[PDB]
Symmetry: C3
Subunit: 114 residues, 3 copies
């Protein structure tokens, strides 16, 4: 899976261990081995949410399977919890787009997963 967070919080406010924490927590949540999980955090962004620029985050989670109505509701709680505690972002200022991808449309290691 691939998890991306874009945020206006400054780089200094993103803990050094945040990417590893996200990796491990997403591995548990998706049931995928952590070696497969990629994480990308983009701080210092020029953003607004609801016309205001208090801390906020725009995220996406991409996976081959393990995406669906109930699962996504559960991922939102996991990810809002982490963003709230580690980045101090209110959960009502977080959007997460979920993508359930076909293996044929995910490239890796000179090929695709298909």
């Amino acid at each position: 899976p691939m998890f991306i967070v874009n945020t206006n919080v400054p780089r200094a406010s993103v803990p050094d261990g945040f990417l590893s924490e996200l990796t491990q927590q997403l591995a548990q949540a998706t049931g995928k081995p952590p070696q497969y999980i990629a994480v990308h955090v983009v701080p210092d962004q020029l953003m607004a949410f609801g016309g205001s620029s208090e801390p906020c985050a725009l995220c996406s989670l991409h996976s081959i399977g393990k995406i669906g109505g109930a699962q996504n509701r559960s991922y939102s709680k996991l990810l809002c919890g982490l963003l709230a505690e580690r980045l101090r972002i209110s959960p009502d200022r977080v959007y997460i787009n979920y993508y359930d991808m076909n293996a044929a449309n995910v490239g890796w290691n000179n090929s695709t997963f298909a």
Copy 2:
């Protein structure tokens, strides 16, 4: 909705009030309340369009509904208009990707919109 603009134009050329202009204009265009609109502007990017590094922009608008043939033409006119007027980017050097998302695939505040 969520609107993202990636451009090679320098930060200094992004007018103050641009995020608010995008928020309000998108509210009127989509008919969605401004409190749900998220906007993200990323200047100073390393990009090319047609091989040329003259000003360009790569955008994306994500929405639950309010996306379609007719609506997208209207959004493109509005958004290229703003990028031309405010950022001095030629409309033929702008791409906008439109995403009509299922409510179940959009996380917000510890749940999804489904």
Copy 3:
């Protein structure tokens, strides 16, 4: 088409002409004229792949058609090859998301391709 590469490799490690090579090679691979290829390279990112912060990349290729099983394998070989040779990123630390988009959902020049 639109190709985006996000990487933790430093900017100084992206060779001069990389955006031109991507434009040219993607035009050849997709069969699309190079005038309509947009490329976006984002170095110096805060990223992890499998919990390691060694060089990695997360990419996407969006196209109206020219996306499918066999084609995507070919694009992945091409693109992972370039990331390995030019940016020194191991192919097993690259993900590429492929998106086959409807013309009605791609804005350009004040309109859409629909």
